[PDB]
């Protein structure tokens, strides 16, 4: 019945920055709130306990404080490998309840992506289904508009996109986008082009192929 | 060292039931309170319920209430959660996690999760397509169901520069994804690449060969 209302539900900065995560609490739990990570594909680690007490293990530069019903989580110095998503918890009543979360992402310069695309195997081809991929390779910020043009004409409804997770090493985002047609469809036209637009991009980047050359 | 081991999931139809395990290492059970905490794709925490073995007192969540059961076995150290009358709404990763220190410490050890999917569509291998060629190459790993699929490169030895995507549900209701690489150009027709698929759930091996 005790909700915890987290915020903000993202941010990013860079490495180094300190950043500030806070939770409130619907009523009075006095100290009774625990901070987790949970990095992407794992459990979720338990990062402080009883409000201000740094679990075993866990890094210096990650603190936490209370101030009536609120209650923040600090990390002093953000580091490259705390890309993650961090949940408050109060256990004062049943149920224990969590805040809803707040991603954290890497702050890094603009990197334009390298851009990709594949035409359908001639194996795929033979099953009946033609699928085109397009493929934006190392790129910050992840916001990106990739539009698909078959014979020149602006495809909607047929593509899905991708997007991994931000890379440990250089902090950037890949992403891939799938163009899904039948095979008969495939076979009517002849240029697939796939069109990015990104921040580091001075331009729209055009990556083309002919059908069958 | 305190250990939290889960089992039991998999893939279940809607209506039907399944029964998780948390087995416990490095501590007894008797002297705290066991929990299961589910996370649906996507999504947020959320507690489900919690025991305490000693006397086998109970808690449950309002939204498995009546159809969920927790247990514990104290002489097995092991916890248990049975589901049944399964929705799709029960479709999650499914953790155990206990109150250390009687609470004060809060849920400082968990178990490596373990996925629970509700469906009534069949299991269903992955077609494997290559994505032909710095240069950029990779295999199309289309149509499988349930989750999950691995993918490696040569076996292991190619890992810089790999990109496995997240898998996306399509309109037809399976899943598909792309891995690939970017490999300096000077490679091309000599070096071997190989994407190596695994889809546990069906019993789905396979090997492609990515040639330009």
């Known amino acids: 019945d005790i909700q915890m209302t987290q915020s903000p539900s993202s941010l990013s900065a860079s490495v180094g920055d300190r950043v500030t995560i806070t939770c409130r609490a619907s009523?009075?739990?006095?100290?009774?709130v625990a901070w987790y990570q949970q990095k992407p594909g794992k459990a979720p680690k338990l990062l402080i306990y009883?409000?201000?007490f740094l679990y075993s293990g866990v890094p210096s530069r990650f603190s936490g404080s209370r101030s009536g019903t609120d209650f923040t989580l600090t990390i002093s110095s953000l580091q490259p490998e705390d890309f993650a998503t961090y949940y408050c918890?109060?256990?004062?009543?049943?149920?224990?309840?969590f805040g809803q979360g707040t991603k954290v992402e890497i702050k890094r310069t603009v990197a334009a992506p390298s851009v990709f695309i594949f035409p359908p195997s001639d194996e795929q081809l033979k099953s009946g289904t033609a699928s085109v991929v397009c493929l934006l390779n190392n790129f910050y910020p992840r916001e990106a508009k990739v539009q698909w043009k078959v014979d020149n004409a602006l495809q909607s409804g047929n593509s899905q996109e991708s997007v991994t997770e931000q890379d440990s090493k250089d902090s950037t985002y890949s992403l891939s986008s799938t163009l899904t047609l039948s095979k008969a469809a495939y076979e009517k036209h002849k240029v697939y082009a796939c069109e990015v637009t990104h921040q580091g991009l001075s331009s729209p980047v055009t990556k083309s192929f002919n059908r069958g050359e | 060292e305190v250990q939290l081991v889960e089992s039991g999931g998999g893939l279940v139809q809607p209506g039907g039931s399944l029964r998780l395990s948390c087995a416990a290492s490095?501590?007894?059970?008797?002297?705290?309170?066991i929990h299961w905490v589910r996370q649906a794709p996507g999504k947020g925490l959320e507690w489900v319920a919690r025991?305490?073995?000693?006397?086998?007192?109970?808690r449950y969540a309002d939204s498995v209430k009546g159809r969920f059961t927790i247990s514990a076995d104290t002489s097995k150290n092991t916890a248990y959660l049975q589901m049944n009358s399964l929705r799709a709404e029960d479709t999650a990763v499914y953790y155990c996690?206990?109150?250390?220190?009687?609470?004060?410490?809060?849920?400082?050890?968990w178990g490596q999760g373990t996925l629970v999917t509700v469906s009534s569509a069949s299991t269903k291998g992955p077609s494997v397509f290559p994505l032909a060629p710095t240069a950029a190459l990779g295999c199309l790993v289309k149509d499988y169901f349930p989750e999950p699929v691995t993918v490696s490169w040569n076996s292991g030895a190619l890992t810089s520069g790999v990109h496995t995507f997240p898998a996306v549900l399509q309109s037809s209701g399976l899943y598909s994804l792309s891995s690939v690489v970017t490999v300096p150009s000077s490679s091309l027709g000599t070096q071997t690449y190989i994407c190596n698929v695994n889809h546990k759930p069906s019993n789905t091996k396979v090997d492609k060969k990515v040639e330009p």
């Open positions: 996690s206990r109150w250390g220190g009687d609470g004060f410490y809060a849920m400082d050890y």
């Open positions: 490095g501590f007894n059970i008797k002297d705290t309170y």
């Open positions: 025991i305490y073995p000693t006397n086998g007192y109970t």
């Open positions: 009523q009075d739990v006095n100290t009774a």
């Open positions: 009883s409000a201000s």
């Open positions: 918890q109060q256990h004062y009543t049943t149920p224990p309840t």
